[PDB]
């Protein structure tokens, strides 16, 4: 699906100008941040299916039961992205802030996934 | 034309050259362009700035459609929870452990649901004072009830200590309010003189420290829940309270940096406050009452 979205468009990185800021010029990708809304929806559906299946592995032995360690991860990721979206909307400073915010969000999401999934197993 | 465009004489009175000055500057004299007060726009005749009406309030619109819908959904959810608690749980021993405490917690959650209606309304000194006091009062009620729940895992003493923990926060909020209740004033934005935003000018930072005092309370409740989750209270609710504590910790730790970052935009001020309050209320109600109603319907 992302290739089908990618094939239609093409890498068009180039300088961009703003009417209210002419002394500074910046270059970025030619695709808007809303282009991956389909991928976001697909991931949301995948998370919903994961939660639904976790709701069915409830009555399982502790070794095979993880309905108290992966349900948190979906909620934590949802909170992370629903907090990143307003910051992205309000900042609108293409030079630095969006790169830092996205990198921090991705790194912390990976960290929370690791801590919720394997850190209890490493502890054992 | 005199449309905000003044004329200078190069070297003779008879000859003049007309050059437009700033659009926000008016003509005090024929040969002078001068700025006027903030929040006022120059008139077409360029003789005197007229005060722009304060129509930039958070009126009901597409932005406001979300918070009110979430508020009414939460009101329906808490009404259903309250009627289930009062219908098929008063006489059974399931709800006998924390009946009054759960009821006052539900009242606090309902007031927090009204809090989004307080936020969305137009600013005024009385409504600003009421909103500022409630923002501490409702959450103090909720988390004092949560802390008493944690300590339970005698009822009169618990109720009295919860009331005292509520009253100390009430007194702190009262002194904060007697400091500067009204706070109402005009707001001026650089390079945005066309738009004048009418909002309560009480410090967002001062509201932030009030919220972080309540956050220190949250952390106390969360560490207590994490300490006491090891031994259940024979009803398997200590772990549920602990999970609620961690989820609210997550919500607040999300809410503080985003608010600090977006302190500029007043619409995002009005929206994120409501979103966070509604999410906290939804998650606490779910994680603390959904298993209760599930076991009630199963039995």
């Amino acid at each position: 699906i992302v290739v089908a979205w990618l094939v239609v468009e093409a890498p068009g990185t180039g300088k961009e100008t703003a009417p209210e800021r002419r002394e500074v010029v910046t270059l970025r990708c030619n695709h808007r941040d809303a282009s991956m809304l389909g991928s976001l929806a697909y991931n949301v559906l995948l998370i919903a299916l994961c939660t639904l299946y976790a709701f069915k592995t409830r009555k399982c032995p502790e070794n095979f039961n993880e309905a108290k360690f992966i349900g948190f991860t979906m909620y934590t990721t949802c909170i992370i992205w629903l907090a990143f979206l307003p910051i992205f909307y309000v900042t609108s400073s293409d030079y630095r802030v969006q790169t830092t915010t996205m990198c921090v969000s991705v790194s912390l999401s990976g960290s929370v996934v690791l801590g919720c999934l394997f850190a209890p197993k490493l502890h054992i | 034309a005199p449309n905000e465009m003044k004329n200078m004489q190069p070297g003779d009175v008879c000859c003049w050259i007309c050059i437009p000055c700033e659009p926000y500057e008016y003509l005090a004299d024929e040969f002078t362009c001068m700025d006027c007060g903030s929040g006022q726009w120059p008139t077409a005749d360029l003789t005197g700035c007229y005060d722009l009406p304060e129509d930039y309030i958070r009126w009901e619109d597409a932005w406001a459609i979300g918070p009110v819908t979430i508020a009414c959904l939460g009101f329906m959810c808490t009404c259903m929870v309250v009627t289930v608690f009062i219908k098929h749980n008063n006489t059974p021993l399931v709800k006998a452990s924390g009946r009054e405490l759960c009821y006052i917690l539900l009242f606090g959650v309902g007031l927090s649901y009204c809090m989004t209606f307080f936020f969305i309304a137009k600013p005024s000194p009385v409504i600003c004072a009421l909103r500022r006091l409630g923002l501490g009062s409702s959450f103090a009620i909720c988390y004092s009830a949560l802390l008493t729940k944690t300590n339970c895992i005698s009822p009169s003493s618990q109720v009295f200590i919860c009331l005292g923990l509520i009253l100390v926060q009430i007194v702190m909020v009262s002194v904060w309010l007697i400091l500067e209740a009204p706070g109402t004033r005009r707001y001026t934005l650089a390079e945005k003189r066309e738009t004048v935003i009418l909002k309560c000018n009480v410090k967002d930072s001062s509201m932030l420290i009030s919220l972080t005092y309540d956050v220190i309370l949250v952390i106390l409740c969360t560490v207590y829940a994490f300490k006491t989750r090891k031994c259940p209270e024979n009803f398997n609710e200590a772990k549920f309270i602990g999970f609620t504590m961690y989820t609210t910790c997550i919500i607040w730790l999300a809410f503080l940096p985003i608010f600090y970052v977006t302190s500029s935009d007043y619409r995002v001020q009005t929206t994120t406050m409501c979103i966070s309050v509604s999410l906290s209320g939804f998650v606490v109600l779910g994680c603390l009452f959904a298993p209760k109603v599930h076991i009630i319907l199963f039995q």
């Binding site: 300088k15 100008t17 002419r22 002394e23 500074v24 010029v25 910046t26 270059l27 970025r28 293409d94 030079y95 630095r96 790169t99 830092t100 | 200078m8 004489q9 190069p10 070297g11 003779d12 000859c15 050259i17 050059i19």
Partner: protein
């Protein structure tokens, strides 16, 4: 700098006024604009610009 001198009434003297800062192409009698993305601040008579989005290995935010 940033001021253009014009003398319509007479040649004896001119009433120089500062025009927009983003137009500095000529700067002898009238100020003219330059191309998009080119700041007219090179040799007081030309336009130049520097690339951005190169904060790789930057101490400020990277």
């Amino acid at each position: 700098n940033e001021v253009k001198s014009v003398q319509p009434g007479e040649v004896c003297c001119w009433l120089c006024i500062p025009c927009q800062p983003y137009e500095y192409r000529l700067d002898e009698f009238t100020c003219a604009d330059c191309g998009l993305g080119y700041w007219p601040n090179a040799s007081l008579t030309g336009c130049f610009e520097l690339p951005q989005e190169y904060i790789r290995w930057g101490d400020a935010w990277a």
